[PDB]
Amino acid sequence: SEVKELLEEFLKRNKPVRIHHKNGEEIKVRITHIGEDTVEFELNGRTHRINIKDILDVKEWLE
């Protein structure tokens, strides 16, 4: 996965991300874990898991 490779780089560099989901949402978060086919973030007692195949694009969340 092309997106997976990029997510792994941002996680390694400790950078926050902007995930463009196929549904048009822009999910701006710090990621916690990358699995075989998923990426996760934690928010308030819940893990949110996104299937990487559902991601159109990922970019850095820049200041």
Side-chain angles (χ1 to χ4, degrees):
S1 165
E2 301 304 293
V3 167
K4 184 173 162 181
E5 291 175 25
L6 185 56
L7 291 166
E8 289 169 335
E9 180 81 351
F10 286 133
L11 179 62
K12 281 173 172 70
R13 294 173 59 216
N14 199 30
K15 297 304 188 194
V17 297
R18 306 188 284 126
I19 295 169
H20 297 267
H21 193 283
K22 60 175 182 180
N23 69 15
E25 280 176 53
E26 188 190 33
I27 300 170
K28 305 204 296 196
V29 296
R30 299 190 71 86
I31 55 177
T32 52
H33 176 75
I34 302 166
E36 301 169 292
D37 42 67
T38 56
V39 59
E40 292 170 12
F41 55 96
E42 262 150 33
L43 195 138
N44 190 28
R46 286 195 219 187
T47 302
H48 290 231
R49 183 175 280 196
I50 301 190
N51 298 321
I52 297 174
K53 69 171 185 54
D54 293 341
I55 299 176
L56 256 299
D57 200 357
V58 57
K59 301 170 194 169
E60 191 173 347
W61 185 2
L62 294 174
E63 207 184 359

